[model samples]
Target: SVLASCPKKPVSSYLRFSKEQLPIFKAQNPDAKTTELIRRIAQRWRELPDSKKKIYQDAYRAEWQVYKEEISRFKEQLTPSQIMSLEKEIMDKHLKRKAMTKKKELTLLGKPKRPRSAYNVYVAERFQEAKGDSPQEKLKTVKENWKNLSDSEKELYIQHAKEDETRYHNEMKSWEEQMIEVGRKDLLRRTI
Candidate 1:
């Protein structure tokens, strides 16, 4: 899970151009200032002219391959169960992040008419199926069912559901911020 443990930031020094490569890059963009030159060359490999961009892109891919191979070699040191646990943890985090992002978008724009929760939707659908009647009848039936439920049962269900909903909302906000970071990284890569 080293990749998961990695800072939620771009790998800053992933591809340091050689001293010889630096001048060549500068010559290709003579008007560029020194600070801007370094920044662009370090991070904007994709923005170079087609010919130069290709060269830098290949170099970056090669560098990334080396990094990946190193990680793979390191992973071989971990036990099978440990690797599995790490993978599961990473996947769970990824899914949770995605769900959170979806939730945040909904909250910011105001909740959609349709329930985003499949579980909630399924319960509602089953209730409707049991009614087998008009909307007016369905609402009456739901009210009757609510009244029959024990106070403690209703409270427990409401509390747990509210907790889950709150967590989803918070996570969504975090995921949105992460998405912004991703966009910034992509924009930086594409331009200076």
Candidate 2:
């Protein structure tokens, strides 16, 4: 309810046009599939001249000005603690979903996996012996077994993880060089 009270955010000119025009195309095409109508509307937006785009841009700025005033009024209605807590809730929600999307992008890009920790290696090795009716219970059983292992016994898996870490660094370096050659230099790590 508090989030609903927050002012609606403004959109970019292009997005604003898409939102405004999609319904018109859908109504005119009555029988057309939503996807096909959207595709045609998207192409229409792309071909639109900057002169026409300025109309939407001007409207966007007007909405943004009103949003600023509305947000200020909304904040004034809340006490300091309420404002801070509401902001934290919003940031937490945004960040959690944002990180999921970023990880999905990297996964789609075929990013290399990081080295597994010693505990991960132990779990991998012992998982077959875990007695449980479900995956969650199996993992809990494995974790409990892991706690009983002596440091010296755990040392072997740590060394294995460390070895894989070196391999990861080597593969990452070569993969970054490959990315540079493919004109995706943007994917490479920033150097000091």
Candidate 3:
């Protein structure tokens, strides 16, 4: 019998679980052989008492739902590129969740935080400074510095500064038009 020779495997076994749950498993068992562990658990599950089996089944399903919800929440916060990067993380955690359900001692691991971009860091620092300074004082300082700026500096500031809302809107509109053009080209290729 091919099925018997191959060994009847758990449908929700570690390999399947690890694809989704590795992140959870890695939290507690940092060096966990996720695939092997899952396989072994699936093999052993049949030997347990019916009462224990039912409890384990129910718990595993509940934890799996939690894993799905957490991944969804994390994804909702991300842009398209960020979401693509997050897929690997979501799969790892899914595996981890399966491993945790089977083995009670396994703990959830903290996800690695994305680093702030240079612009974000600059804005954060500026916001902190703004909170302590008076608006009038800030305006006065900007006025004092205005005369000292070189022609290039003044031009760059005028072009790139956040105060230039019209320029920002125009640049964003141009970007949208470029993206639409690229999308149209892709669609034409697919149709051809």
Candidate 4:
């Protein structure tokens, strides 16, 4: 005597009646696997005349409204960082799925990559003067120079960073144009 167990399901018209329809299906096809039975009943729910399904949808929509408010309340309780993590978690899964599909690869933005900080633009310009220094010594020098920089000195780099930002963006636009011209446009933003 096999019996189907009811489990939590989404607040959907399909699911609400799927739970109710299980026993009838089980009696009709005693050997059907749980998933098979579920699929069959869900199809049945899908094919119903609008009138029958309306009753199911009407009831479920009421519950759906309540669930929406509950989810909103829960989201409001979460910190911004927590909300970000939650979004990233769900988006990461979707991104993975997209990776597995025949999706066109989106190229890096046509805009110049944003510099990490004001110091970055400064380092690029200064690194060349110490071009002959050993790599480790160069790093140490950079570390010291940045560490000792006055607020005014750092502010100067911020101005340079803005100029560099425009230079980078403008150059990137040219690259994007080149990609478009090459007829590999299906690969949007495929940065050189």
Candidate 5:
């Protein structure tokens, strides 16, 4: 229900053409399956003359222009409280989508683990030696030690973290190449 009153984004020209064609095709082939009718419609769309396609494109552009104006107008009317609520709603939606992707990634086999940070390296080495009666107490002491450590001492952890970072990228590159070989290129890092 986030921004329920906001104007909806306009569909692309192809979808507009499909929307118009579906009813006509369904009427002509009453017994045809939904997928069959959609296939026929898509085939017709491919063969449709540029002039006819332009008509749908122009209609979409006009709708998009109106949508922009309407959305801006709607946004101008929101109070401070309304804006805050809208921001929260948007954040909640973003978090939910992020969680979905995270869950999907976790389920993937052979996914390369992200590189550990300097703090992670320090904790790994120090956890065993940290004085405490419990794991929680030990972690607290480790955190305190890390905070008190000199930059010169911390440099060792940072250097190891940097090396680990390079290792991760190298492994990720090879893993991404393997993913491409298996036709799972979608798993590849977008920037690389």
Candidate 6:
């Protein structure tokens, strides 16, 4: 499945103001450490009158609204699992990036994937030689090609896909039995 690309979270008003004032604070308090300078700025901000503070607060709320719209649109393009995956990644974004090792791709859970519709199959095969078209344009090509296939030819892939569906179900049954035999039932947990 294709995954969603998550947008980074927006900065808070205090952080935004702190960043803007960093140079000025450093210049004024040359002997102070970075943490000490930050503390001074935070105190200054806290002591500012409500009228001045409202400017920052309004900016904060406006940025938050933009963030909500962007996040909503992003989530609309993804499945529930993809949303969960994105949420987990955001939770751990502060951590160092982990390295990946290359490995051979194999059938998952001893269950081979069943093919989607023949039109999609044609699109997948043709996609190697096709490019530079909008998704709607590409589908227009696929839709036209779908009507050109002979009934028997179309049935061939259809029969194969339908048969593989049963194969997938049978393998799933076997896999579930094995999962039950092992003490690894947590692997099938819905929340995972």
Q: Would you estimate the TM-scores of all the predictions?
A: 0.37, 0.61, 0.25, 0.41, 0.48, 0.43
Better candidate number, 1 or 3, judged by lDDT: 1
Ranking by TM-score: 2, 5, 6, 4, 1, 3
lDDT of 2 by residue, 128-168 (tens): 77899798999999999789989988899999999989888
Please report the candidate that would top lDDT against the real structure: 5
RMSD of 6: 14.5
Clashes of each: 1, 0, 14, 2, 0, 0
Candidate 4 residue pairs in backbone clash: 107-189, 107-190
lDDT of 5 at 178: 84
Go through the candidates in order and give the C-alpha RMSD of each one to the true structure: 17.5, 5.1, 18.2, 13.7, 10.5, 14.5
Greater TM-score among 1 and 2 belongs to: 2
Q: What is the C-alpha lDDT of each candidate?
A: 0.60, 0.86, 0.52, 0.72, 0.88, 0.69
Better of 2 and 4 by lDDT: 2
Identify the superior model by TM-score, candidate 1 or candidate 4. 4
How do the residues 1-192 of candidate 6 rate in per-residue lDDT, one tens digit apiece?
333356656788788889888899899888889999889899988888989878988998998889899888988988899878876765665342321111121233343444465454566766545443777777676667678889987886677567656776776667656777866464343641
Give the runs in model 6 whose Cα sits over 4 Å from its true position.
1-5, 91-192
Error of 3 at 32 (Å): 19
Candidate 3 Cα outliers beyond 4 Å, as residue runs: 1-44, 88-192
CA deviation > 4 Å runs, candidate 4: 1-9, 33-39, 98-192
As a TM-score, model 3 comes out at: 0.25
**5 or 6, greater by TM-score:** 5
Show the colliding residue pairs in model 2: none
Worst 10 residues of 3 by lDDT: 1-10
Best by TM-score: 2
Model 3, span 87-188: residue lDDT tens: 566577799998777455212221222334333333433443443387777555545555576776555545445444555456545644554665633311
- Looking at candidate 1, the ten consecutive residues that score lowest on lDDT are 183-192
Better of 4 and 5 by lDDT: 5
